[PDB]
RNA sequence: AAUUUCUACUGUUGUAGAUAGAUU
């Protein structure tokens, strides 16, 4: 059996960055501290933190200015309003496309306007902090203007005192602009036109515009129905400052005057809002404002509606109240480093909750109590109020009705009888694909659903209303608990102390968590009402404007928990040490940007090799010529070997730029012919000719002529002449890109220069060069074991075997870092003193050490770090169309392939099954045990040992689980190569498992991702260097990871199949239970049992038999289930039940006589008694239960009611080795069967491009049943 | 209970596997 992956190696190139520690050598540290370089860069990091804040202030200013300047045409806004309001009442896919496009053209206008502005162009690049040509810095100009105009910008900021400091901080970065290269990338979004929730455009159109339109419609209707509601004269006198607007967009006339409430609500005048200042003005109009002298609040539109509602004593008028506009991004309104932060932030949050007053001017508790009481009182319109259809509704159904499926089944069935009573995608749109469901729909559906069910089993809508009537009671507990928190807060109020996370405080922490949990859970219950836009649907719906106005107002204030919850939790679970570090550049703006020899004086970083040890060194800025050609000539000696780095990147643009520019032109002497070639670009099929010259058709002789000129010029070039290019004969290539590729592949070359030890020692001794040793425990003298993979890669960079045909390449843009001391150095385990060994199975229970052992020693001392990127498979091309290649490879080699199916068990962390092409199981075992002869570690026992109330334990379990996964991906890899398999996982994107498992969906998703990334480059440490699977040749079975969503049905060699119906199936017969006896009602039970083909007693065998065809009741077949086994009945203690004896008892109890083996079907249908059918369906369900488990015994198994051709029943305990041994093994096995289907579809695919990797349940059932 | 970093460790100044850094 050859390895089907034997030739899948060196397939595609990918980048990786290796990490190492730098150990100062000789007098290096002494000189560095003497110059104080580290402290300077440390201050530079703090100045970075402040500098981000300054650049934020400039961003905020620019947002205001540009948005104030921006105008948008009335036609587009009116198109928006029209499609929007049309979309409210009727949801048409046409209006969906129309709404998206009408929205997108608004965003396009806003973005296209801002991007052409001058302040924006220099905003994200080097020119922001740097002075171009003569021009000074835009940011500095802004700061200087802010000092000249006497505005105090930074008074709010604690870090920055005054504008002079900000100017000095910004000037400090003038050559250091690269410090912000990451920062600017993140801020690039702020102005983006895409779907990002953090954008100025997104807030304008996606957030504020609908609210404004609603406010407009409420204003117009208010004028119509309530003409004297607003006092129009008085609002001008009070709010005049806000009523003043610079430009009227309706008439496009520029004049400064108070605007009429009619004018402010003109759709064209939205442009005066949409920026922070206008948003503030508008909001003041809506809600009113305060003047410091007055002592009373100036009334707003809303208060006028409120008071006029009092005069006429009408509650309807409040339905016209208006929602506040969202504040613009980066507006002037965080991280918890100590106990004071936890205490103060929590106190502030809950004080905000308690003191908040809604639009109705009552507390959140009072508002919600009044609100939900109204919903129960029926006063509200249930046609206009919606439940979100996500897990929130399922959770509601389970909460009140004790079944998650009731509501969904009820609405589906109700709508089915509604729109299609007589007899498909249409009903789905109305129910299953509906993003939000109306309360009216739920009530009607439930009533009609309850009409046919016994009063015993009925589920009532009044229960749901009572459920939400109950919620405000939670507030009382909150109010109580925070009072206790007050006393807890005082002891932890200390400013610098961390003691909250010590052991003595755990009880208080429990109190804190319980409080936060109560609030967070309260939010989760309310989350169902929230209206959240989801992609692929606008989710604009006709709604009660008062209900959602007050509810959204409460919800958004309450929703602040999740940031608070996450921050406090993160604080409690933080590790003893700290990972904080800051960048080290020694006096040089560009440190590692390239290793090139020509750029050595500029970049200042060089690499040495001494014996098997590797050293990095950095020349002092003043003396960077240390290694110039004369010096390496004078000092050549055998002590250290400096690395000579030569690279020709980007051949396509590099060759022409060098040969065809400036003085080089005269040197390289391009001929009149080849100059004609270049100008008209005849050498390129499609390329830009030199501007001013017209593109010509590709001519092959011309291209080859150009190649010849390039070769000649390479021979003349001083540096590239020594690269020793070996080129195919110029006549051989069909395209210029092939020559470029040869140039690029041979362009990277690494050589060494010997340097005397005395020269290195002296030059570091004088402070001229800083020498560090690149180190990890694999480089220690004591380390005889197997090295880290990264250690193998780093060693491989300089290996001669690698240098012949380059696999591992050295990359530029490396970085050095400094990490200060995070913890006291404590001797946890003194030497010569024995230690208990934590591993349960370890033979030696004690270990004795001659040297001290220090917990988390790496963080006890300051340390230097080095991050060096490298390129893997440099000569190989980029990765594309990988799945097609893999599928073809399987197509040819499918005779030899296997299926490795992995599943997260209920009693097992993970389980796998190797399956034959025919479907037999070659091997199955648990992943619980990770071990070699030295050590076996059982993660199942370890994990079960830990199991989780407090935050710290939950975190420890999660972290351990993720690390255990890091172990398991290797086992999977070994099995893949060994057995020639393909990995089959359950699909976690859609169709993920329902139940309770030892490994959560989120963690298992991590496992799938980790296995993808591991199979990107797969190396076995013991495999031979040159041979496949070795350091040079690593199996590449997967394309690089992209996103969880794009994993899809197949990634590389890994296939994701739906997990549905995996664990509930009979292995031999493929039996599935798709007919679920629920005992809906007596009559329905009679109909349900009547559909059975025949129900009788088998006299010879001794068990009852139920025979049926699914056609009468998704699944198809003739089954004839049996009662044979004993079933353990599912926390609370287990009892073993015998279905045969139970049925004997039930039938004997009634008139029915089974003892003759006559068919009972008619007699069963004869009884009208509730009790008979209730117990009968219960017994039948017991018969249908395949998985039986004892909670304490940790034993579960699968047995199936249907019989094979021999009449033997499948039992996991009596099962052979090629059949699943336990209940979880079944699920793994059937995941493999779905993979077998995918294997077959790969095997049989034809010239048609599309391979169908999606497995429908019908296909699943048919395949599984007849195959054996 | 030692680590470029992570998990489990003692597998002995480290052991097995994992490990794309930076940035927000
Ligand atoms: Mg090792
Ligand atoms: Mg540890």
Task: Concatenate the DSSP letters of all residues of A895-962 into one string.
Answer: TT-EEEEEE--SSSS-EEEEE-TTS-EEEEEESSEEE-SS-EEEHHHHHHHH---SHHHHHHHHHHHH
**How far, in Å, CA of A46 to CA of A56, rounded?**
16
Co-location of A389 and A432 in the same domain:
yes
- What is the Cβ-side half-sphere exposure of residue A936, based on CA atoms within 13 angstroms? 10
Establish whether A829 is a catalytic residue: yes
Nearest to A794 by CA among A815, A783, A779: A779
Query: From ligand 2's centre to the CA of A955, what distance in Å?
Result: 14
Contacts of A1181 (CB under 8 A, 6+ apart): A1076, A1077
Strand B–CB A809 distance below 7 A: no
- Name the residue closest to the C1' of B19 by its CA: A790
Domain boundary among A195, A220, A238: A195
For residues A1006, A1012, A1017, A1021, the Cα torsion angle rounded to the nearest 10 degrees is 60
- Report CA-CA distances (Å) from A1239 to A420, A1062, A1186, A1232, A1261: 40, 17, 28, 10, 17
Question: Residue A52, SS3?
Answer: helix
CA of A854 to C1' of B12 (A): 14
Domain boundary among A747, A762, A781: A747
Co-location of A212 and A185 in the same domain:
no
**How far, in Å, CA of A160 to CA of A609, rounded?**
46
DSSP string covering A580-642: --EEE-SS-SSSBS---STTHHHH-EEEEEETTEEEEEEE-SS--GGGSHHHHHHT--SSEEE
Question: Which ligand has the nearest atom to the CA of A575?
Answer: 2
**How far, in Å, CA of A59 to CA of A67, rounded?**
12
Co-location of A545 and A619 in the same domain:
no
Question: Which ligand has the nearest atom to the CA of A858?
Answer: 2
Strands A981-986 and A1054-1057: parallel
Instruction: Determine contact, residues A45/A99, Cβ cutoff 8 Å.
Output: no
Domain boundary among A293, A320, A347: A320
Co-location of A110 and A121 in the same domain:
no
**How far, in Å, CA of A1252 to CA of A1057, rounded?**
12
User: A579: which nucleotide lies closest, measuring CA to C1'?
Assistant: B5
Q: State the residue range of the domain holding A1216.
A: 1082-1225
- Name the residue closest to the C1' of B6 by its CA: A963
Co-location of A917 and A1053 in the same domain:
yes
A697-704: long-range pairs with CB below 8 Å, 24+: A700/A734, A702/A677, A703/A735, A703/A736, A704/A730, A704/A731, A704/A733
Sign of the Cα torsion A1022, A1027, A1033, A1038 reads: negative
Quickly count: other Cβ atoms within 10 Å of residue A18's Cβ.
Answer: 21
Q: Is residue A4 part of a domain?
A: no
Strand B–CB A53 distance below 7 A: no
A545-558 helix and A364-377 helix, angle to the nearest 10 degrees: 140
In residues, how long is chain A?
1268
A82-85: long-range pairs with CB below 8 Å, 24+: A84/A210, A84/A213, A84/A540, A85/A213, A85/A217
SS3 content of chain A, % helix, strand, coil (to 5): 45, 15, 40
Q: Is residue A662 part of a domain?
A: yes
- Report CA-CA distances (Å) from A47 to A51, A61, A787, A818: 6, 21, 40, 16
- Report CA-CA distances (Å) from A1219 to A207, A295, A1229: 57, 83, 8
Query: From ligand 1's centre to the CA of A853, what distance in Å?
Result: 19
Instruction: Determine contact, residues A258/A236, Cβ cutoff 8 Å.
Output: yes
Nearest to A496 by CA among A337, A335, A347, A334: A337
Q: Is residue A660 part of a domain?
A: yes
Nearest to A727 by CA among A750, A713, A707: A707
CA of A911 to C1' of B4 (A): 33
Token pair, residue A971, equals 């086992």
Nearest to A252 by CA among A64, A67, A76, A74: A74
Q: Give the helix/strand (H/E) hosting A112.
A: helix A93-115
Co-location of A974 and A1041 in the same domain:
yes
Establish whether A855 is a catalytic residue: yes
Contacts of A1204 (CB under 8 A, 6+ apart): A1068, A1069, A1210
Q: Is residue A568 part of a domain?
A: yes
Of A16, A27, A613, A829, the catalytic one is: A829
DSSP string covering A1026-1090: SSBTSSSB-B--SPPP--TGGG-SEETTEEEE--TTSTTS-TTT------------HHHHHHHHH
Residues 1078-1097 of A with CB within 7 A of strand B: none
Co-location of A678 and A764 in the same domain:
no
- What is the Cβ-side half-sphere exposure of residue A21, based on CA atoms within 13 angstroms? 15
The set of strand B positions with any atom below 7 Å of a protein CB reads: 1-24
Q: Is residue A578 part of a domain?
A: no
CA of A601 to C1' of B19 (A): 33
A915-925 burial: b if 16+ Cβ within 10 Å, else e = beeebebebbe
Query: From ligand 1's centre to the CA of A617, what distance in Å?
Result: 27
**How far, in Å, CA of A944 to CA of A646, rounded?**
55
**How far, in Å, CA of A608 to CA of A918, rounded?**
57
**How far, in Å, CA of A23 to CA of A774, rounded?**
7
Residues 562-621 of A with CB within 7 A of strand B: 575, 577, 579, 581, 583
Question: Which ligand has the nearest atom to the CA of A855?
Answer: 2
**How far, in Å, CA of A1010 to CA of A847, rounded?**
34
Instruction: Determine contact, residues A122/A128, Cβ cutoff 8 Å.
Output: yes
Using a CB cutoff of 5 Å, list residues around ligand 1, an ion.
A 785-786
Q: Is residue A6 part of a domain?
A: no
- Residue A642 φ/ψ, nearest 5 degrees: -75, 145
Q: Is residue A879 part of a domain?
A: no
Task: Write down the experimental method used for this entry.
Answer: X-ray
Distance between terminal CA atoms of chain A?
Answer: 25
**How far, in Å, CA of A472 to CA of A468, rounded?**
8
The vertex-A365 CA angle with A364 and A367, nearest 5°, equals 60
Sign of the Cα torsion A672, A678, A680, A682 reads: positive
Co-location of A417 and A541 in the same domain:
yes
- Name the residue closest to the C1' of B18 by its CA: A966
DSSP bridge partners of A341 = none
Of A663, A838, A918, A1249, the catalytic one is: A838
A1159-1194 burial: b if 16+ Cβ within 10 Å, else e = bbbebbbebeeeebbbbbbbbbbbbbbbbbbeeeee
- Report CA-CA distances (Å) from A629 to A625, A632, A957: 9, 5, 58
Query: From ligand 2's centre to the CA of A576, what distance in Å?
Result: 11
Question: Which ligand has the nearest atom to the CA of A828?
Answer: 2
A353-379 burial: b if 16+ Cβ within 10 Å, else e = beeeebbbeebbbebbbebbeebeeee
User: A973: which nucleotide lies closest, measuring CA to C1'?
Assistant: B17
**How far, in Å, CA of A1059 to CA of A1070, rounded?**
15
**How far, in Å, CA of A605 to CA of A602, rounded?**
9
SS (H, E, C) A244-308: EEEEECCCCEEEEEECCHHHHCCHHHHHHCCCHHHHHHHHHHHHCEECCCCCCEECCHHHHHHHH
**How far, in Å, CA of A161 to CA of A1070, rounded?**
75
Token pair, residue A502, equals 């010590």
Q: Is residue A622 part of a domain?
A: yes
Co-location of A549 and A535 in the same domain:
yes
**How far, in Å, CA of A629 to CA of A642, rounded?**
12
Give me the residue label for tokens 């020594």.
A722
Domain count, chain A: 8
Co-location of A138 and A268 in the same domain:
no
Instruction: Determine contact, residues A63/A330, Cβ cutoff 8 Å.
Output: yes
Query: From ligand 2's centre to the CA of A855, what distance in Å?
Result: 8
Instruction: Determine contact, residues A986/A1058, Cβ cutoff 8 Å.
Output: yes
DSSP bridge partners of A151 = none
Establish whether A224 is a catalytic residue: no
Instruction: Determine contact, residues A677/A683, Cβ cutoff 8 Å.
Output: yes
Token pair, residue A522, equals 């309260």
Query: From ligand 2's centre to the CA of A259, what distance in Å?
Result: 68
Strand B–CB A641 distance below 7 A: no
- Report CA-CA distances (Å) from A431 to A445, A463, A529: 11, 22, 17
Strand B–CB A776 distance below 7 A: yes
DSSP symbol at A814:
B
Establish whether A491 is a catalytic residue: no
CA of A516 to C1' of B24 (A): 26
Co-location of A191 and A247 in the same domain:
no
Co-location of A770 and A621 in the same domain:
yes
């Amino acid at each position: 059996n050859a390895s089907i992956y034997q030739e899948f190696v060196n397939k595609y190139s990918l980048s990786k960055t290796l990490r190492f520690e730098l150990i100062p050598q000789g007098k290096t540290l002494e000189n560095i501290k003497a110059r104080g370089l580290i402290l300077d860069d440390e201050k530079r990091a703090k100045d970075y933190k402040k500098a981000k804040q300054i650049i934020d202030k400039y961003h905020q200013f620019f947002i205001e200015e540009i948005l104030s300047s921006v105008c948008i045409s009335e036609d587009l806004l009116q198109n928006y309003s029209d499609v929007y309001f049309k979309l409210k009442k009727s949801d048409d896919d046409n209006l969906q496309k129309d709404f998206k496009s009408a929205k997108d053209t608004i965003k396009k206008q806003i973005s296209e306007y801002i991007k052409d502005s001058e302040k924006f162009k220099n905003l994200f690049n080097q020119n922001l902090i740097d002075a171009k040509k003569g021009q000074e810095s835009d940011l500095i100009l802004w700061l200087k203007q802010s000092k000249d105009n006497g505005i105090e910008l930074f008074k709010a900021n604690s870090d920055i005192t005054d504008i002079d400091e900000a100017l000095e901080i910004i000037k400090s970065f003038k050559g250091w602009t690269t410090y912000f290269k990451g920062f600017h990338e993140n801020r690039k979004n702020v102005y983006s036109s895409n779907d990002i929730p953090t954008s100025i455009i997104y807030r304008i159109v996606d957030d504020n515009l609908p609210k404004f339109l609603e406010n407009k419609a409420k204003y117009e209707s208010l004028k119509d129905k309530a003409p004297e509601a607003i006092n129009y004269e008085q609002i001008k006198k009070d709010l005049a400052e806000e009523l003043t607007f610079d430009i009227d967009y309706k008439t496009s006339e520029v004049n400064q005057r108070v605007f009429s409430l009619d004018e402010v609500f003109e759709i064209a005048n939205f442009n005066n809002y949409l920026n922070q200042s206008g948003i503030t003005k508008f909001n003041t109009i809506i809600g009113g404002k305060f003047v410091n002298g007055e002592n009373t609040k100036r009334k707003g539109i809303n208060e006028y509606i409120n008071l006029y509602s009092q005069q006429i004593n009408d509650k309807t008028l409040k339905k016209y109240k208006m929602s506040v506009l969202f504040k613009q991004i980066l507006s002037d309104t965080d991280k918890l480093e100590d106990d004071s932060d936890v205490v103060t932030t929590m106190q502030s949050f809950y004080e905000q909750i308690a003191a908040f007053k809604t639009v109705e001017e009552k507390s959140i508790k009072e508002t919600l109590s009044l609100l939900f009481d109204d919903l129960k009182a029926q006063k509200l319109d249930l046609s206009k109020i919606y439940f979100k259809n996500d897990k929130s509704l399922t959770d509601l159904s389970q909460q009140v009705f004790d079944d998650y499926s009731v509501i969904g089944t009820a609405v589906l069935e109700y709508i089915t009888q509604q729109i299609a009573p007589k007899n498909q995608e249409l009903i789905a749109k109305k129910t299953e694909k509906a993003k939000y469901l109306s309360l009216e729909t739920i009530k009607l559906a439930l009533e009609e659903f309850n009409k046919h069910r016994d009063i015993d089993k009925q589920c009532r809508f009044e229960e749901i209303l009572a459920n939400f009537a109950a919620i405000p009671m939670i507030f009382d507990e909150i109010a109580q608990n925070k009072d206790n928190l007050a006393q807890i807060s005082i002891k932890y109020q200390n400013q610098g102390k961390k003691d909250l996370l010590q052991a003595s405080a755990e009880d208080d922490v429990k109190a804190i968590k319980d409080l936060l949990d109560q609030t967070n859970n309260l939010l989760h219950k309310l989350k169902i009402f929230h209206i959240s836009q989801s992609e692929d649907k606008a989710n604009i719906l006709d709604k009660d404007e008062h209900f959602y106005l007050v509810f959204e107002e409460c919800y958004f204030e309450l929703a602040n928990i999740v940031p608070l919850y996450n921050k406090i939790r993160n604080y409690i679970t933080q590790k003893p040490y700290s990972d904080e570090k800051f960048k080290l550049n020694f006096e040089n703006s560009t440190l590692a940007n390239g290793w090139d020899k020509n750029k050595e004086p500029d970049n200042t970083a060089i690499l040495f090799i001494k014996d098997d040890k590797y050293y990095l060194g950095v020349m002092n800025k003043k003396n960077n010529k240390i290694f110039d050609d004369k010096a390496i000539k004078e000092n050549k000696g055998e002590g250290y070997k400096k690395i000579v780095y030569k690279l020709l990147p980007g051949a396509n643009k590099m060759l022409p730029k060098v040969f065809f520019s400036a003085k080089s032109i005269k040197f390289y002497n391009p001929s009149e012919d080849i100059l004609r070639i270049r100008n008209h670009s005849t050498h390129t099929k499609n390329g830009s000719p030199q501007k001013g010259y017209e593109k010509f058709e590709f001519n092959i002789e011309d291209c080859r002529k150009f190649i010849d000129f390039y070769k000649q010029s390479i021979s003349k070039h001083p540096e590239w002449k020594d690269f020793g290019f070996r080129f195919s004969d110029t006549q051989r290539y069909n395209s210029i890109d092939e020559f470029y590729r040869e140039v690029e592949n041979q362009g990277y070359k690494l050589t060494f220069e010997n340097i005397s030890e005395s020269y290195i020692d002296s030059v570091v001794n004088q402070g001229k060069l800083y020498l560090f040793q690149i180190y990890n425990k694999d480089f220690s003298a004591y380390s005889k074991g197997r090295p880290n993979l990264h250690t193998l890669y780093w060693k491989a960079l300089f290996d001669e075997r690698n240098l012949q045909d380059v696999v591992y390449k050295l990359n530029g843009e490396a970085e050095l870092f400094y990490r200060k001391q995070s913890i006291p150095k404590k001797i946890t385990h003194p030497a010569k003193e024995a230690i208990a060994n934590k591993n349960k199975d370890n033979p030696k229970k004690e270990s004795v050490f001659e040297y001290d052992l220090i917990k988390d020693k790496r963080f006890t001392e300051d340390k230097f770090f080095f991050h060096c990127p490298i390129t893997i498979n440099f000569k190989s091309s980029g990765a594309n169309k990988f799945n097609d290649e893999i599928n073809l490879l399987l197509k040819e080699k499918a005779n030899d392939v296997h299926i490795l199916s992995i599943d997260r068990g209920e009693r097992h962390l993970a389980y796998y099954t190797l399956v034959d092409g025919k479907g037999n199981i070659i091997k199955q075992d648990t992943f619980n045990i990770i071990g070699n002869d030295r050590m076996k570690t059982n993660y199942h026992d370890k994990l079960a040992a830990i199991e989780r109330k407090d935050w710290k334990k939950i975190n420890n379990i999660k972290e351990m689980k993720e690390g255990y996964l890091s172990q398991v991906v290797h086992e999977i890899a070994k099995l893949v190569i060994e057995y020639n398999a393909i990995v089959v996982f359950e699909d976690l994107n859609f169709g993920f498992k329902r139940g309770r498992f030892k490994v959560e969906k989120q963690v298992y998703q991590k496992l799938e991702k980790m296995l993808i990334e591991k199979l990107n480059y797969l190396v076995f440490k013991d495999n031979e260097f040159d041979k496949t699977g070795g350091v040079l040749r690593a199996y590449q079975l997967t394309a690089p990871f992209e996103t969880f969503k794009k994993m899809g049905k197949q990634t590389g060699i890994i296939y994701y199949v739906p997990a549905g119906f995996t664990s509930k199936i009979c292995p031999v017969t493929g039996f599935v239970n798709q007919l679920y006896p629920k005992y809906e009602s007596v009559s329905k039970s009679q109909e349900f049992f009547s559909k059975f083909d025949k129900i009788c007693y088998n006299l010879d065998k001794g068990y009852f038999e139920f025979s049926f065809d699914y056609k009468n009741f998704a699944a198809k077949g003739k089954w004839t289930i049996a009662s044979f086994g004993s079933r353990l009945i599912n926390n609370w203690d287990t009892r073993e039940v015998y279905p045969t004896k139970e049925l004997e008892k039930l039938l004997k109890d009634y008139s029915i006589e089974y003892g003759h083996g006559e068919c009972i079907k008619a007699a069963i249908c004869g009884e009208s008694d509730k009790k008979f059918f209730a117990k009968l369906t219960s017994v039948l369900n017991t018969i249908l239960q395949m998985r039986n488990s004892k909670t304490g015994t940790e034993l579960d198994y699968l047995i199936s009611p249907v019989a094979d051709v021999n009449g033997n029943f499948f039992d996991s305990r009596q099962a052979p080795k090629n059949m699943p041994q336990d209940a979880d093994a079944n699920g793994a096995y059937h995941i493999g069967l779905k993979g077998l289907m995918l294997l077959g579809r790969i095997k049989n695919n034809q010239e048609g491009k599309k391979l169908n990797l999606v497995i429908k349940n019908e296909e699943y059932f048919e395949f599984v049943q007849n195959r054996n």
